[PDB]
């Protein structure tokens, strides 16, 4: 979160928190009412955000679901959508934490080692998160879509 | 909530510190061979 | 850190005697299998990622250590596994070439089971991963070479237990 | 460059060795001496150390 | 109906072994039938004679030098005019069965020896013995055994063709009838001269009393304690030699048990038992994260099925098919083998292994605290500051006696 | 474990004799025959995941009705257990070639199998369609040697004779 | 062993009483719903060969380490042995429901099952899970709320015999723990 | 009971494995000296009637209170049993040398021998010396260094079977201690 | 046993040949009569299998209520434990005879024996009879005045070793009284 790494920043520097750090912990907690509303929208829209998320993913990447693709059959396609439910969950954590620190140490650190070791095309799962982003930002206003989309594209950046 | 929790800090942590006691590499507490036996009180002739 | 030749020289040196017929008798036995070990270490270097991918999918891929709460849930924790399994398949390759498991306890076994208990890593699932990794290694290098590479896997599993 | 010391990040993240141990092993590594030891002189290597 | 009929009903027409004896511990070890053939070689007559001397004397040293009254009862059998039932009746009427198991035996020790020797089982209930007590005291011992082997029990489960054996019959009509069975037929070593203690009470190993244990278990309903049914035990002799993950064989009792080791072990087996009851309510639905999308990912994946081998050409390459039952679901060799690796990797099974491993370490550590006053202790632990107090002044538990002098 | 040792030390122990020349001669047969039957224990071990894959789908190609609802192979988990069981029967045949007799089959797979396959409503004819496909997929000098194909098949149709 | 009539006889023989009219109001009510007890225990016995396979395999889906090599329900001997005591316990509970008295359960089925299952290495917490699935089924078949089979019954209440067969299953849970 | 072939089966069942190429080199080396093992059992069972009188009478000249009255080799029936368990132990050790694993030693000979010898009142420390003279004889016969009878052999090393038969007598001498 | 006389350490790498800082003067002085003491313990432990069986049967045939049912030596577990404890006591006098002092006996064998035998109901008046036979047995064997058995010692004297070992047996016999 912004609270924990604004601390560990000033922790390492042998000092307390500046006004630049304490006027933002202050500014973040007054932002906390609006963050829970945004995460509350994505919380009980996972049925559509995931299922329509895998909608565009297969239309854009039919190789991964075609015979020979990693997510082929009734089995892998279920797990094919399971990971999108994971990453959609971590974005709800990042929105409430005000940072990608929850998304950092979960689903991002060493993610290329996992998916390379699973045979999954890491570029394909990046395409899946982008398809979820258009569904997510379509569910919110412009002021919110600059945030909810904002955490997806960070996940897109670290996932390639 | 899973029973075999783990160690570490930050996100992805189960609320238990690293190493179960915040020590990664624990200094040992045992004595050597002959005075682990000396404390036992049974290996006296040995 | 001794190979079969280093261990033979040490025991023959530690008594201050020359290399008699019994010491050279084992050394000739090691040189006979010298051709087998390199080809065994050859294919294992080639299929390092494939062997580890086969072991985890065959032993602990879908068990509930893989699911939330299990010991392998987060991506950092999953990525630590294949990093961790790489050492077992790598150091076992060194023991297979050196013909002596001294390198394992020198560089792998000591402080290992005492470390997994600290982190809370399940030793039970770890050994079965190495056992499954031993099973696929016998596929590649053959039977007798698998017997050689397999002889150091369970050495890790025994001491890690 | 995608370099990796997985063994050293192992033994330091667990606390099995210090940062000073992790720093010394980095210095005696071969990716170091290929970088800051081979292309230079022992004179210049001392200052870069 | 998994078992159609017991062993006490005879095997009907269509089996060589009864249905309970197939999947019991009958098939593993040496407690089988060695039924005599029609005409046989005198070596094969010696095989059926050596199993009779093992069974009806109970590993006793029969001292082949004498075989004094034996060789008349042998020669009636080697002709063929004596049945194996009539041989094992005639051995139970001799003097060398009387001077072992009757001249020094209590009438509880004698009845429990005739159940092991003549039949297979142990005595089940109390009034089963009380028939055979009152039949001996009014008719005598020669009319006891004649009224003991000619009931409905022996002629069905052995007939007149086979020798007796220990009847691992699967269905036990009290559950303690398996417990007293394995406590009587005490392993492959112990004989009944040893088990009744007839040698140690003997004046130079001769004419000693055959006293009995387990007399308190036939009067009251009380089970056998588990150490007599797991250590000196025929289940160790007909052992499957499995990999049993709770190992049923008990550890030998340790010297120098401490109360500090037990008092954390009892808290550990309460810790796992309270954590097992939480984790078993969440099993098989909420522990499977891929289960929630199985309703959609196997209807998303039901598009463009391929009937022969070859298609999904994908722009003109091969990329074919497997078309089996497994790989149409996308599964691999690491997908059915994931059930065999479910001891470390499981969570509910990870508790129940260490529950029964540490309770089995508890039940031999707590039972090693039956030795109190002169026992030399030790301190194998590093004498840490953790110590439970000796606060046992007033009532803390007090099991509810609402009738204190109710009269 | 019914083997060549545990018949000559089970019959001698019931007789109370030392291992005579009749029982040392029986383990001389455990040196000549075991040169071949361990070769069929080694080829089956190194290729086990492709044999059961080639055999377990012949259970469902012959009997396609198992994927109907209410039947035995109706969902994902019950299909994976059906491939698991043919891996079990192919594992005990690997255990029986390395023991020397039918020891691991008569104790671990066969005994009690007619009571669990009737109670759980599994068709036992579907099991022998998978094992008899494996007996007829066996090319004798290609899979293994000529003699090792005799040893591997003679435990296979013994297992067929047990289930039928 | 006893039944529901002969339970109050040894209760009345402890004070050497005759069986008078104040005692017999329970027993005259016992034969008043004696049609219901045979109508109850028919529903368990007609589904008993699928009640065990619903329960022992329902223990498996909760604790899947038992079918792994090592777990005590792995080998075809062990599964046929665990199914065998699945229906020994179901036989004696249906005996105890029929007699209406728990004496035949506790001297013939449960007397020493605890020390037996310690000696074989059978895990005692998993056998409670086999019993409690059979506890939830016998109270479902008696009240006819089984979610894939309804049987024909006369209209009326039955939850007394559902409670009685529930108390005969927790005696199995208390005996082996 | 097990042998050296089926000990590595139930070890390979503990890891749910096939007996692959790693473990068969342990067993093909076991049948490589399979002619050596049968040449080692034949040295035991050819002198086995003489080794049991050599070993029980060596116990008597060390601890002569057994043949003292009130002892445990005084009565002549009680002497003839002590010659019997000298050779039943030698029957089960020779099965363990034949099978290559000490399961039949630790499920049939030592299965209750410790509580046998307590309950017969047999001195246990003299049962160690009855066993351990047969350890020092069998390692003299298998190495063919018995000081009054040499058997004919094809020459070569045999010291692994010597320590194998010394390992089976120590599992007897520890289980009855 | 092996702490009862001191060894000298002559080789290097020991830290007792050089930085020993002592020689054990109390036990160098006991090899000044060491062969005569070692013959005396050899006179006991070569008859220790027979001395315990004669003494335990000695108090049986003088007080016959112990093998009566209800007595403390009727059952087989108690009769095996009574023959075990006399054997343990005869070993611990033979430590104290060998080491030359009773300090091994009073803490490993006698510390907490009178509280044990009243916690088990062991007759203390009969157990002191059982050691006075072994007091009288051991002075016959050390002085070589046993009636049925002699041993070929050297020519000399062994009183004041017989009265040394007779001073240990009443030291046992008053520690349980
Ligand atoms: C350890 C036991 C073991 C075996 C028994 C074989 C069994 C076997 N053979 C084949 C595969 C094959 N088997 C054969 C051989 C033949 N085909 C025939 O119809 C003739 C009867 C016979 C000629 C000798 C051929 C030609 C193939 C490849 C094509 C095919 O599947 O038929 C396959 C499918 C996987 C593969 O391609 O290898 C399997 C499991 N392999 C093993 O590992
Ligand atoms: C020791 C050796 C050994 C075996 C031989 C098997 C035998 C076996 N199979 C099953 C269990 C099963 N076996 C099958 C198998 C089949 N049903 C089908 O659709 C096909 C006809 C067939 C496979 C080709 C199924 C579906 C189950 C699960 C039954 C159920 O859940 O109702 C069970 C019950 C426990 C379980 O695994 O869930 C057992 C003991 N297991 C073993 O451990
Ligand atoms: C008269 C009353 C009566 C009973 C109540 C039952 C109970 C019972 N079960 C077994 C015997 C057994 N019982 C089990 C049972 C189980 N293992 C598990 O993991 C599950 C928790 C559980 C089944 C649900 C197993 C696996 C064996 C066999 C052990 C073996 O063969 O060594 C035995 C020993 C018999 C034998 O093995 O020969 C008895 C007495 N049988 C009876 O006769
Ligand atoms: C892991 C695998 C798995 C199973 C096998 C079942 C096992 C199972 N069944 C029931 C619950 C039940 N189980 C049955 C049993 C049966 N139904 C019938 O009609 C037949 C007679 C018999 C199957 C042959 C019945 C009758 C109920 C009561 C509810 C009902 O089904 O109508 C319960 C308790 C409540 C519940 O959790 O549903 C469990 C654990 N559940 C599982 O999660
Ligand atoms: C030989 C075998 C044999 C039987 C099977 C029973 C058959 C049976 N059941 C009932 C009759 C009945 N049975 C029930 C029981 C039930 N109804 C429900 O709603 C519940 C689901 C279930 C309770 C567990 C009820 C409520 C009646 C009607 C009241 C009664 O007659 O007791 C009756 C009396 C009315 C009639 O003649 O139909 C009879 C004969 N009796 C027998 O002699
Ligand atoms: C299958 C396992 C198996 C064995 C290992 C043996 C050993 C053995 N010996 C005896 C029985 C005996 N065993 C001994 C033996 C000895 N006493 C000594 O002082 C010596 C140290 C030792 C001889 C070497 C004696 C003296 C008896 C006689 C007891 C008696 O007759 O009362 C018994 C009791 C039999 C009986 O008397 O009914 C057994 C089980 N027999 C077996 O069946
Ligand atoms: C006081 C009485 C007394 C004895 C009778 C002997 C008995 C005896 N012999 C040996 C030692 C041995 N004992 C034998 C036995 C025999 N030799 C053979 O050739 C025959 C097969 C068999 C006699 C029939 C053998 C073979 C050895 C090994 C060395 C050898 O003699 O070649 C040992 C073990 C080593 C030792 O402790 O010294 C003992 C106690 N020693 C004694 O102190
Ligand atoms: C049916 C009965 C039966 C037997 C008795 C053995 C008989 C036997 N022993 C050996 C053969 C041998 N036996 C030995 C053993 C020894 N040599 C020594 O110097 C030691 C004293 C002793 C070790 C214990 C050695 C070293 C060989 C030769 C190497 C070998 O063949 O293994 C051989 C192979 C050579 C030959 O043709 O003779 C045979 C058949 N095998 C059987 O099938
Ligand atoms: C190191 C020193 C040392 C000892 C001296 C003994 C002392 C001793 N004896 C017994 C235990 C016993 N001791 C006896 C012995 C006797 N009772 C009699 O009536 C006879 C007079 C006498 C035999 C000579 C008996 C019979 C028991 C068992 C008590 C019982 O089971 O009722 C116990 C209890 C634990 C056990 O069972 O062993 C102890 C500590 N043990 C030791 O560790
Ligand atoms: C009522 C039954 C009854 C017995 C069982 C015996 C037992 C017995 N023996 C001795 C007394 C003795 N007991 C022995 C013991 C032995 N002598 C030997 O040669 C053997 C090696 C060893 C027995 C195995 C010795 C050496 C003496 C001393 C007397 C003597 O010189 O023999 C004493 C003590 C006498 C005294 O204190 O003065 C008793 C009670 N006597 C009895 O009255
Ligand atoms: C919270 C962060 C996080 C992630 C992301 C994660 C992923 C993860 N993905 C897996 C499998 C898988 N993942 C896929 C995924 C895909 N196939 C495709 O074609 C697509 C490109 C892609 C999805 C959009 C497939 C097919 C498998 C099964 C692979 C196999 O069975 O071999 C598995 C192994 C099975 C399991 O335990 O679920 C893990 C652990 N774990 C985590 O903790
Ligand atoms: C060369 C000898 C050697 C070994 C073996 C070694 C192991 C080692 N394993 C570690 C962690 C780990 N190891 C695992 C492994 C597993 N999880 C499971 O469920 C499986 C059973 C298992 C894979 C087989 C996991 C998940 C972690 C991360 C733990 C955490 O973040 O708390 C760590 C902590 C630091 C790090 O990974 O950076 C070390 C030091 N170090 C060494 O020097």
UniProtKB/Swiss-Prot annotation, chains G, H, I:
(2R,3E)-phycoerythrobilin 2 binds at residue 158. Phycourobilin binds at residues 50, 61. Contains two covalently linked phycoerythrobilin chromophores and one covalently linked phycourobilin chromophore. The modification N4-methylasparagine is found at residue 72. Heteromer of 6 alpha, 6 beta and one gamma chain. Light-harvesting photosynthetic bile pigment-protein from the phycobiliprotein complex. This is B-phycoerythrin beta chain. It comes from Porphyridium purpureum.
């Amino acid at each position: 979160s912004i609270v924990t790494k604004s601390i560990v920043n000033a922790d390492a520097e042998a000092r307390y928190l500046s006004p630049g750090e304490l006027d933002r912990i202050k500014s973040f907690v007054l932002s906390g009412q609006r963050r829970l509303r945004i995460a509350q929208t994505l919380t009980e829209n996972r049925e559509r955000i995931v299922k329509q998320g895998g909608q565009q993913l297969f239309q854009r990447r039919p190789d991964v679901v075609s015979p020979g693709g990693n997510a082929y059959g009734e089995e892998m396609t279920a797990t094919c959508l399971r990971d999108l439910d994971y990453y959609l969950r971590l974005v709800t954590y990042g929105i409430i934490a005000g940072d990608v620190t929850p998304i950092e140490e979960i689903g991002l650190v060493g993610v290329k080692e996992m998916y390379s070791a699973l045979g999954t095309p890491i570029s394909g799962v990046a395409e899946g998160i982008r398809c979820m982003k258009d569904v997510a930002c379509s569910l919110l206003s412009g002021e919110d879509a600059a945030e909810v989309g904002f955490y997806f594209d960070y996940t897109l950046a670290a996932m390639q | 909530r899973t029973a075999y929790p783990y160690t570490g800090s930050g996100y992805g942590s189960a609320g238990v510190p690293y190493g179960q006691d915040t020590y990664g590499y624990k200094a040992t507490t045992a004595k050597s061979i002959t005075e682990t036996a000396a404390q036992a009180g049974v290996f006296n002739t040995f | 850190m001794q190979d079969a030749i280093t261990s033979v020289i040490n025991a023959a040196d530690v008594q201050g005697k020359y290399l008699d017929a019994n010491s050279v008798e084992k050394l000739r036995g090691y040189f006979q299998t010298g051709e087998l070990r390199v080809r065994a270490a050859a294919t294992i270097a080639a299929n390092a990622a494939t062997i580890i991918k086969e072991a985890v999918a065959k032993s602990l891929l879908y068990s509930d250590i893989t699911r939330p709460g299990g010991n392998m849930y987060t991506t950092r924790r999953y990525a630590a596994c294949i990093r961790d399994l790489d050492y077992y398949l790598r150091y076992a390759t060194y023991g297979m070439l050196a013909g002596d498991p001294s390198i394992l306890d020198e560089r792998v076994l000591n402080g290992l089971k005492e470390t997994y208990n600290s982190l809370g890593v399940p030793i039970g699932a770890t050994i079965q991963a190495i056992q499954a990794m031993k099973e696929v290694t016998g596929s590649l290098v053959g039977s007798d070479a698998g017997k050689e590479m397999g002889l150091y896997f369970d050495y890790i599993c025994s001491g890690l237990s | 460059y995608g370099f990796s010391f997985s063994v050293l990040e192992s033994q330091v993240k667990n606390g099995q060795i210090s940062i000073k141990e992790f720093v010394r092993s980095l210095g005696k590594s071969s990716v170091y001496q290929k970088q800051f030891y081979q292309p230079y002189v022992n004179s210049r290597v001392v200052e870069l150390a | 109906k998994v078992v159609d009929r017991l062993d006490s009903q005879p095997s009907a027409a269509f089996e060589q072994t009864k249905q309970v004896y197939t999947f019991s511990r009958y098939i593993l070890g040496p407690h089988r039938a060695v039924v005599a053939p029609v005409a046989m070689d005198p070596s094969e007559k010696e095989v059926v004679l050596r199993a009779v001397y093992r069974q009806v004397f109970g590993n006793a040293y029969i001292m082949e030098e004498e075989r004094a009254e034996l060789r008349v009862m042998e020669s009636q059998f080697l002709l063929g005019e004596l049945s194996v039932k009539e041989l094992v009746r005639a051995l139970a009427k001799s003097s060398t069965y009387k001077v072992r198991f009757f001249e020094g035996a209590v009438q509880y020790r004698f009845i429990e020896l005739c159940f092991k020797h003549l039949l297979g089982r142990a005595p089940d209930n109390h009034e089963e013995i009380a028939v055979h007590m009152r039949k001996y005291q009014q008719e005598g011992y020669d009319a006891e055994i004649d009224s003991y082997l000619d009931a409905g029990e022996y002629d069905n489960v052995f007939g007149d063709d086979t020798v007796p054996f220990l009847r691992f019959r699967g269905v036990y009509t009290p559950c303690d009838s398996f417990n007293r069975q394995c406590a009587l037929q005490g392993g492959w070593a112990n004989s009944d001269k040893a088990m009744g203690g007839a040698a140690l009470s003997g004046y130079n190993g001769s004419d000693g009393r055959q006293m009995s244990t387990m007399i308190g278990n036939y009067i009251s309903g009380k089970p056998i304690p588990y150490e007599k049914v797991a250590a000196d035990t025929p289940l160790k002799s007909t052992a499957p030699n499995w990999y049993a993950r709770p190992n049923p064989a008990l550890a030998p009792q340790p010297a120098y048990v401490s109360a500090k080791e037990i008092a954390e072990l009892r808290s550990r087996v309460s810790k796992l038992e309270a954590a097992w009851s939480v984790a078993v309510k969440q099993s098989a639905a909420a522990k499977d994260t891929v289960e929630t999308w199985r309703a959609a990912a196997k209807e998303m994946a039901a598009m463009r099925g391929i009937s022969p081998m070859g298609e999904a050409y994908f722009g003109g390459i091969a990329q074919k098919v497997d078309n089996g039952a497994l790989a149409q679901l996308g599964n691999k060799a690491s997908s059915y083998k994931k059930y065999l690796y479910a001891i470390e990797t499981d969570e509910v099974s990870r508790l129940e292994v260490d529950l029964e491993e540490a309770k089995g370490q508890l039940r031999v550590l707590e039972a090693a605290m039956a030795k109190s006053t002169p026992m030399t202790r030790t301190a194998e632990f590093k004498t840490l500051t953790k110590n439970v107090a000796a606060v046992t002044a007033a009532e803390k538990a007090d099991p509810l006696s609402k009738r204190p002098r109710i009269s | 474990m019914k083997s060549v040792i545990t018949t000559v030390v089970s019959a001698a122990d019931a007789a109370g004799r030392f291992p005579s020349n009749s029982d040392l001669e029986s383990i001389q047969g455990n040196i000549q025959r075991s040169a071949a039957r361990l070769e069929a224990a080694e080829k089956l071990a190194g290729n086990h995941e492709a044999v059961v894959k080639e055999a377990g789908d012949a259970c469902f190609a012959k009997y396609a009705y198992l994927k109907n609802p209410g039947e035995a192979g109706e969902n994902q988990e019950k299909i994976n257990k059906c491939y698991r069981d043919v891996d079990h029967y192919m594992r005990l045949v690997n255990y029986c070639l390395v023991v020397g007799g039918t020891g691991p089959l008569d104790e671990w797979g066969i005994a009690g199998a007619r009571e669990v396959y009737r109670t759980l409503n599994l068709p036992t004819s579907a099991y022998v369609a998978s094992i008899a496909y494996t007996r007829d997929r066996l090319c004798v000098p290609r899979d293994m040697s000529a003699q090792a194909g005799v040893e591997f098949s003679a435990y296979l149709d013994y297992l067929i004779n047990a289930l039928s | 062993m006893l039944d529901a009539f002969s339970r109050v006889v040894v209760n009345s023989d402890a004070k050497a009483a005759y069986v008078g009219g104040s005692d017999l109001q329970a027993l005259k009510s016992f034969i008043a719903d004696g049609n219901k007890r045979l109508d109850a225990v028919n529903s368990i016995v007609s589904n008993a060969s699928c009640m065990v396979s619903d329960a022992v395999s329902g223990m498996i889906c909760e604790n899947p380490g038992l079918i792994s090599p090592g777990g005590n329900c792995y080998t075809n001997r062990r599964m046929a042995a665990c199914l065998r005591d699945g229906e020994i316990i179901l036989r004696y509970v249906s005996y105890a429901l029929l007699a209406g008295d728990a004496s035949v359960l506790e001297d013939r089925c449960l007397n020493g099952l605890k020390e037996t299952y310690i000696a074989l290495g059978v895990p005692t917490n998993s056998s409670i899970r086999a019993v409690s699935i059979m506890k939830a089924q016998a109270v479902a078949f008696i009240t006819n709320t089984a979610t894939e089979r309804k049987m024909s019954f006369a209209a009326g209440d039955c939850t007394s015999l559902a409670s009685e067969v529930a108390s005969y299953f927790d005696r199995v849970g208390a005996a082996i723990s």
